[PDB]
Amino acid sequence: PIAQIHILEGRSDEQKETLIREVSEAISRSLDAPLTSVRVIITEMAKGHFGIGGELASKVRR
Amino acid sequence: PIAQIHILEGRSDEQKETLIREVSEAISRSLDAPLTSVRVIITEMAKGHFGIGGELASKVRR
Amino acid sequence: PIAQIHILEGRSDEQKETLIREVSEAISRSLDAPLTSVRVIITEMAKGHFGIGGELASKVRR
Amino acid sequence: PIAQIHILEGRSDEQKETLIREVSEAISRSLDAPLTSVRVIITEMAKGHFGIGGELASKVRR
Amino acid sequence: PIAQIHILEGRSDEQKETLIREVSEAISRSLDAPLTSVRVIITEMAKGHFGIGGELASKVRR
Amino acid sequence: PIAQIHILEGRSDEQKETLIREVSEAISRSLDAPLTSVRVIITEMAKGHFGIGGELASKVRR
Ligand SMILES: */C(C)=C/C(=O)C(=O)O
Ligand SMILES: */C(C)=C/C(=O)C(=O)O
Ligand SMILES: */C(C)=C/C(=O)C(=O)O
Ligand SMILES: */C(C)=C/C(=O)C(=O)O
Ligand SMILES: */C(C)=C/C(=O)C(=O)O
Ligand SMILES: */C(C)=C/C(=O)C(=O)O
């Protein structure tokens, strides 16, 4: 399984590391797949490249 | 956060349901984000549409 | 420019056709790009393959 | 609905903002979905990371 | 490396098989990476889900 | 056809150029499509944004 996760910029490397570890275990337990076959890609979005309801995330999020 | 997960076809709806629930919480706890902002997309691949090392998964996986 | 749009299953072919036409023009006008260079991909998700807040869309949307 | 748009680097923040706003309204009108549920991700590509017909966009585009 | 390839529906399984094999080797030779670490995902688009220049591919391609 | 390739950061521009050229020809020969219609997007991943088996690629790859 491959997971690509888009998140707004801002998190710490520690949080991203945890994210990768947690999501990998979640996928592994859920599908009963070896943890070693799980790949996770984190794609960070700049506040000016994400829109919700038509507005920029920078005008509406931290 | 938005997560797209590519998995091989075959799992039950129960397993996918669990996948969606488990990955959502993992993301939520990890980034300390409200569980309600987390979206998860499961994309299923046909065994003849996934290749590892140049070989089809149908030739090399269950 | 290339746009991939993930939407829940259910729309008519007419609506999707309109989606493709309307998003293409929006991109074209917005970036001042020739309408002919714009590609649009519509990816439909099964209600059991999309989750919002940990819950399936089939349990939480029409 | 979620839209991911890949575009070559170069546009202004104003153009990207418009893109996000225009595409969101286009998706909303087309599908008759609340504008507030539409998310748009803009992924910018470096001229050296996009190829058309085998050539780099930097050799063949502004 | 992971490659996702979007192609119009219609090809035979033989052609897709070749696609997967040929792109895997191309990536392997190009990046000087072990062929065994290369994953390829083929995503097929329905003619009514792909638009070029605002028009559906079913209206404009075989 | 459109190809998006995720690779770890580190390659040279020459290698990426080759990758784009090789993959484009591979897709073109395989599908018997005009080379001019093939688009290739290279998305580079930071060693800290890719996980394999739950670990960061930075702890386990060059
Ligand atoms: C998930 C994409 C698993 C995989 O690729 C493998 O089985 O090696
Ligand atoms: C993750 C994509 C979160 C989000 O969209 C939000 O904060 O509403
Ligand atoms: C958007 C992806 C435009 C493009 O590919 C072109 O300029 O041909
Ligand atoms: C489009 C992806 C809409 C959506 O997620 C929602 O209904 O909240
Ligand atoms: C490409 C995504 C290669 C990879 O995952 C690996 O080195 O195992
Ligand atoms: C592959 C996506 C080919 C294409 O878009 C075209 O036929 O112009």
Side-chain angles (χ1 to χ4, degrees):
Chain A
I2 292 140
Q4 181 174 9
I5 304 153
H6 275 93
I7 63 176
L8 255 195
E9 65 186 333
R11 280 58 186 61
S12 54
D13 296 326
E14 299 77 61
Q15 263 172 324
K16 298 199 254 190
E17 216 187 307
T18 307
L19 174 73
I20 284 178
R21 187 219 313 144
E22 296 300 303
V23 172
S24 295
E25 309 242 43
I27 293 159
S28 179
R29 294 188 262 98
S30 305
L31 299 182
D32 214 335
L35 179 61
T36 56
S37 50
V38 188
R39 278 169 171 77
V40 172
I41 303 160
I42 289 168
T43 303
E44 264 191 340
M45 317 180 279
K47 259 143 216 171
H49 287 161
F50 189 50
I52 308 109
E55 282 141 318
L56 295 186
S58 64
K59 285 183 259 134
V60 107
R61 289 268 185 298
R62 182 192 215 233
Chain B
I2 294 141
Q4 190 173 8
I5 306 161
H6 272 93
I7 67 177
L8 257 194
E9 71 184 328
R11 281 60 182 59
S12 50
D13 292 330
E14 297 75 59
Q15 262 177 321
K16 297 199 260 199
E17 217 190 306
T18 301
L19 178 65
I20 289 177
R21 190 219 311 145
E22 297 298 304
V23 172
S24 296
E25 311 241 41
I27 293 161
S28 186
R29 293 187 264 99
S30 297
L31 299 181
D32 211 337
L35 178 61
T36 61
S37 54
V38 187
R39 284 159 169 78
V40 173
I41 303 172
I42 289 170
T43 304
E44 272 198 329
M45 328 177 267
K47 260 147 215 164
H49 287 166
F50 188 52
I52 307 106
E55 280 153 313
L56 298 182
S58 56
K59 290 182 256 135
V60 111
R61 290 269 181 302
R62 186 197 212 231
Chain C
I2 294 141
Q4 190 173 8
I5 306 161
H6 272 93
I7 67 177
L8 257 194
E9 71 184 328
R11 281 60 182 59
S12 50
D13 292 330
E14 297 75 59
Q15 262 177 321
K16 297 199 260 199
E17 217 190 306
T18 301
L19 178 65
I20 289 177
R21 190 219 311 145
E22 297 298 304
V23 172
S24 296
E25 311 241 41
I27 293 161
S28 186
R29 293 187 264 99
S30 297
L31 299 181
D32 211 337
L35 178 61
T36 61
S37 54
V38 187
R39 284 159 169 78
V40 173
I41 303 172
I42 289 170
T43 304
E44 272 198 329
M45 328 177 267
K47 260 147 215 164
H49 287 166
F50 188 52
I52 307 106
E55 280 153 313
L56 298 182
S58 56
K59 290 182 256 135
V60 111
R61 290 269 181 302
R62 186 197 212 231
Chain D
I2 292 140
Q4 181 174 9
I5 304 153
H6 275 93
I7 63 176
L8 255 195
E9 65 186 333
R11 280 58 186 61
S12 54
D13 296 326
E14 299 77 61
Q15 263 172 324
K16 298 199 254 190
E17 216 187 307
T18 307
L19 174 73
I20 284 178
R21 187 219 313 144
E22 296 300 303
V23 172
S24 295
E25 309 242 43
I27 293 159
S28 179
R29 294 188 262 98
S30 305
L31 299 182
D32 214 335
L35 179 61
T36 56
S37 50
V38 188
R39 278 169 171 77
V40 172
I41 303 160
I42 289 168
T43 303
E44 264 191 340
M45 317 180 279
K47 259 143 216 171
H49 287 161
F50 189 50
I52 308 109
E55 282 141 318
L56 295 186
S58 64
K59 285 183 259 134
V60 107
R61 289 268 185 298
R62 182 192 215 233
Chain E
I2 294 141
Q4 190 173 8
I5 306 161
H6 272 93
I7 67 177
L8 257 194
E9 71 184 328
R11 281 60 182 59
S12 50
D13 292 330
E14 297 75 59
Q15 262 177 321
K16 297 199 260 199
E17 217 190 306
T18 301
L19 178 65
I20 289 177
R21 190 219 311 145
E22 297 298 304
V23 172
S24 296
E25 311 241 41
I27 293 161
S28 186
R29 293 187 264 99
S30 297
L31 299 181
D32 211 337
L35 178 61
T36 61
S37 54
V38 187
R39 284 159 169 78
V40 173
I41 303 172
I42 289 170
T43 304
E44 272 198 329
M45 328 177 267
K47 260 147 215 164
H49 287 166
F50 188 52
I52 307 106
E55 280 153 313
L56 298 182
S58 56
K59 290 182 256 135
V60 111
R61 290 269 181 302
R62 186 197 212 231
Chain F
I2 292 140
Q4 181 174 9
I5 304 153
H6 275 93
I7 63 176
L8 255 195
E9 65 186 333
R11 280 58 186 61
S12 54
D13 296 326
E14 299 77 61
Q15 263 172 324
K16 298 199 254 190
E17 216 187 307
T18 307
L19 174 73
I20 284 178
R21 187 219 313 144
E22 296 300 303
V23 172
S24 295
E25 309 242 43
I27 293 159
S28 179
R29 294 188 262 98
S30 305
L31 299 182
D32 214 335
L35 179 61
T36 56
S37 50
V38 188
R39 278 169 171 77
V40 172
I41 303 160
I42 289 168
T43 303
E44 264 191 340
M45 317 180 279
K47 259 143 216 171
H49 287 161
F50 189 50
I52 308 109
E55 282 141 318
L56 295 186
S58 64
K59 285 183 259 134
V60 107
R61 289 268 185 298
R62 182 192 215 233

